[PDB]
Each structure stands twice: as C-alpha cells, then as structure tokens.
C-alpha cells in the first residue's frame, strides 16, 4: 500500500526536483477505484524521503462473492501501485528534470521500500527479479496471525532496495516489475492498462535474464 524513496546526498531536497513534487506541498491524485497520496515524511539537506500512499475504496472496487467485498486489495502493493506511480511520477519516469538535468542523467545513491507485495513464488522470485538490475535486496515476511501460528505464514513480503541507479530507472523497474507478482491483475483492471504497463520494458527488459518469466506472467 506504501512506496517510499529515500535520498541522502546533500542537498537531499534535490529529490523533490527530480520527482517534480514540492516537499512542502502534499498532494492527492485520482485513480480508478480510489486515490493516491504523495507527501514527504522527511525533507532536509541531509535526508529526503518521499511516500506514495494508496487510498483504495473497498466499495467502488467491488462495484467495478464474499471476497469481492472483503479482500486485501486496499492494503497491498498490487498493480494499483504501478498505476499510481505513473500518475504521480510520470515526468521523472521519462527522465526529464530541467532544474537538475545533471542529477537526472547519472546514478544516484537511492533506497526504496515496497510494503506488502503479495508473492506466490516467495522470496526467490523477488531476488530473481531485482538482483540482476543491480540492487541490494532485503526481504521480510509475515505470519498470518501471531495469535494463531498454526495458520502459518502469509504470502506478503516487504521489500527493500538499495543501489546506485538513475531515478528514472528506479521508477521504471518498480513500475514494470510490481505487476509481475500480481497474479490477479487481469481481474481488477484487464487488458487496457495491462498492455500500457508492459510497453515500458522496451529496453532493459529485453536484456533481463528473467525475460521469459516476466513475459509469461503478463
């Protein structure tokens, strides 16, 4: 439900120009079946962190079986997170930054956190997808209910990425790779938008060692 991006090269507030969002001005964007919020929990010379928050309406979602009404969709980083990234960070994804063109053209020290990514294939799939792009990848998992350990573990993983990468590459990688894990995407949107967010791979994807796996899941 949450994506954060953290930058620590002084002046770290440069993250604001690169993402085309003023750290002092929180914003809300409209999505299909809800909203996305962007704001900066921290913004100093030493450390800047941006947050992208999904605000999914459970009623409008269902109107678009019992588990059509009660489900994990409002709380996970599904393809909705990709759709939101494109809606909020579209210019940064393209590589444009007229205020800091030099920073946008080079590798920057960056950290990203993606919460509650549902993944049927486990940790293994996540490493196979992100490691070959050069990230240092941290994964943590969760039990379904700590009062009922017998129910076993969830299929949710919170993923940490760290590396030296261009802003546009970090955004593109997450934009394209998140839906690879979303086994129920063709259910919640179907065809129109799914095609839109596969066209974006037109480069590194053809060279990704998991091209088959990625093209398959689509």
């Amino acid at each position: 439900m949450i994506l954060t991006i953290t930058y620590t090269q002084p002046p770290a507030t440069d993250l604001g120009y690169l993402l085309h969002k003023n750290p002092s001005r929180p914003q809300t964007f409209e999505l299909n079946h809800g909203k996305a919020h962007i704001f900066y929990p921290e913004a100093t010379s030493e450390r800047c962190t941006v947050a992208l928050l999904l605000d999914i309406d459970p009623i409008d979602l269902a109107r678009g079986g019992l588990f059509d009404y009660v489900n994990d969709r409002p709380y996970v980083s599904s393809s909705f997170m990709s759709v939101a990234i494109s809606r909020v960070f579209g210019t940064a994804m393209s590589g444009k930054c007229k205020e800091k063109p030099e920073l946008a053209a080079i590798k920057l020290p960056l950290k990203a956190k993606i919460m509650m990514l549902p993944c049927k294939g486990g940790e293994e799939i996540i490493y196979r997808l992100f490691e070959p792009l050069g990230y240092k990848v941290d994964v943590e998992g969760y039990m379904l209910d700590e009062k009922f350990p017998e129910w076993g573990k969830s299929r949710y993983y919170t993923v940490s990425l760290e590396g030296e990468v261009r802003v546009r590459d970090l955004l593109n990688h997450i934009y394209v790779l998140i839906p690879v894990l979303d086994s129920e995407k063709h259910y919640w949107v179907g065809e129109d938008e799914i095609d839109k967010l596969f066209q974006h791979g037109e480069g590194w994807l053809v060279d990704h060692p998991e091209k088959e796996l990625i093209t398959g899941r689509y």
Binding site: M1, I2, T4, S24, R25, P26, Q27, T28, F29, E30, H37, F39, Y40, P41, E42, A43, A51, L53, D57, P58, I59, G65, L66, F67, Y69, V70, N71, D72, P74, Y75, V76, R87, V88, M115, M116, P118, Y142, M143, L144, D145, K147, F148, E150, W151, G152, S154, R155, Y156, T158
Partner: protein, 407 residues
Amino acid sequence: GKKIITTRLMSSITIHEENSIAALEVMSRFAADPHWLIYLPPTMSPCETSKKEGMLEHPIEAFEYFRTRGVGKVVCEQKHMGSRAVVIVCKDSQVAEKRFGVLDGTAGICYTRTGRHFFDDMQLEAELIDRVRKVLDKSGFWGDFNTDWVCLDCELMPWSAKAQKLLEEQYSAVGISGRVVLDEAVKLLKQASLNKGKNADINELLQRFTERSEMMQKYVEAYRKYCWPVNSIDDLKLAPFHILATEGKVHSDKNHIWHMDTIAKYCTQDDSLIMATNHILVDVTDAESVDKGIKWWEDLTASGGEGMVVKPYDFIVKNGRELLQPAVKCRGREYLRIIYGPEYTMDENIERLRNRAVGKKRSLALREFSLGMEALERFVRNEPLYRVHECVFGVLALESEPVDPRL
C-alpha cells in the same frame, strides 16, 4: 428439465435446470447417505437497514417487520457464530436401520447445510452423537416423547473448526496486510506532520489513516473472537435451537419459547458440551419491551456475540394467506466488519451500503423454509425416500441461485 414441487405452505415452487445440476454435483460427490437426509436448513434474511447514526443493522427494523404484519410477540435468540449442524440421534443401530433404512451400522449423524458429514472422522461424529444420546437418556426424553429418534437443528462452535481455510486465505490475510501498512501509514504521516493533481492537508490525512487503522484493529479482534484451537471433542460447543421431529410428529406447531425450554431441559443439563441459548421474549407493540430487547442486544454484541435471530413467537406464521419470515437476522456493529469489511463503518462507506435489496433474499428463505418443512412432514408420515429427497434436494438447488452474500 424444469422441476415443480408442491408443499403445504406454498403449493408451487420451481426448481430450474441450472440449479438442479449445481445441486446434483455436491449431492452425489460429497453428501452423506441420503437415508439420513430428511431435512436441510434454509438460508435466512436480514432486516431493512437502520437509519440510526453509524448503524447498518438494528433491532428496531426487525421488530417492525413483525409488528406491521400482525405478529405481536417475537423471540430473540443469540445468533451463535459457528456452522449449522443437523443432528439426528437414534437409540441404537437397529432403530436407524428400521426407521431410516440406513445400512452402515451407525446410530446417528451430524451433517451440514449442504448435507455433508460435519466431521471428516466418523469416530468423532459417533462420539458426539453418543454424548447427546446420554443426555437424552438421563432427562427421560425418549419416554416423554414416545420416540426412539430425534432430529435437532443446531449450531456447532467454534467457527474456526470448519472455516480454517477461509481464515487462512482470506480473513487473516486482510488482517495482517491491513494492520501492517495502516500502522506504517500512520507513522509516516505523523513524521510528516511534525516536519511540516490537487493539494492535500497532512493533518487530515493523518486523522483519516488513524481511523482506518483503528477499524482494521477492531476487524481483527472481531474475527478472532470466533476462533480457538480444537484438540478434542471437549473444545466444541453444540447449541440446538429447534427440535424438528420425533416419531410421528414434526414440532413446527410449537412456539419458540417451547423449543428453547424443552431443549434446555432435555439436552443441556450436566454436560457443558451442549449449551442452552440465551433468549428473550419481546412484545413488539410495547415501548418498554422493545427497549429491553434493544438493551439485551446491545449487551450481547458488546461482549462479542454476533447478534440475534429474531423469530415470530409461533414457529410458522401467516399474515392472512401470506407466509412470513420464520426468522430475521440482526447482527452486531462490530461483527459486521467480517461481512461488509473492516472499514464499512466509515461515513463515506456506510452511507453507500444502506440501499440494499432484501427482496430476493426473503423470497429464497420462504421457498427453502417451505421445502424443509415439507421434507420433514413427508418423512414423519412415512412417504417413500424419493418424495422426502426431492424437497431436500430442492433446498440445495435454490441455494445455488446467485444473491448478495453479505445478507
């Protein structure tokens, strides 16, 4: 082809082709011996939505359903949160063979609303049946009812005993994902708040997500209340609410106070496995009595009860020639987060949920109720199996008709 069934309460009930085939599937692949299947319980309707602030269901509307249709008194019973279980007990295996035609040597059965054995393990079933046999033995039930068999309508707790796959794959999945991201959301906004498309206000966002978080927490507490580990038969609880049938008699002519009283006396003494049902009588014409009903429902649900089943004083009731609901469900505010969603109580959500249509659900219940009554009367008057079976099969078929699952 199409199937027309005739019942005493409704002379024409149609079973369509689609429904008959969907029923045939589950009936032939997983169901118990059809010689035991003398009844299937009906689906149940909820009330009109409430107006009262931040409430979806409330006692007043269920009370009004009956009062405006000429029924002066209702019995409110705690809605146990488990799985419906039909419990048939014979005195011995010779009674089952003679009366029922059952050949596998069993002397009883506990089955579900779809007609499957409740327990995967027969020994556990036989064990449960035997505990019920002994209580009936000591209360003098067989003699007082001149019968060597009985068919009880019950709830079997805990819910988690049958719903574990649902809890694992759906309910606890929403709960862990929900609690984790919502807490992290609150924490980030709080940090943003302290360090302070369209413009948003950080403090409003923080307030909103703080509320989403508190609701998610209460949703998790709500589902947990109906779960606990089962390591033996002693972790279970059986709560019978209808005595349906004994030799020569379908007890649909007895009022619900009678059912509650007779069950408490013959079934629940000196065996904590078999519990009585908390209930009250309400005069729906009287303001004071209605106030008690409300208070009693508020206390029950505040202490974690699902809600109540509101029943007409008499078992079967009519407004002129019009058959009325034999039961209306009225569920707690907190319980309903498991049905309508953890966040259904938030203003922008709960208002969109007030416009629900129970017409279809009400019609399915009457038809299923009428088939079940007919199955029981055909069996009690000794008609051949296929005449009993077609009504029971009919209930199964109607249950495959699509309808809002939150009702």
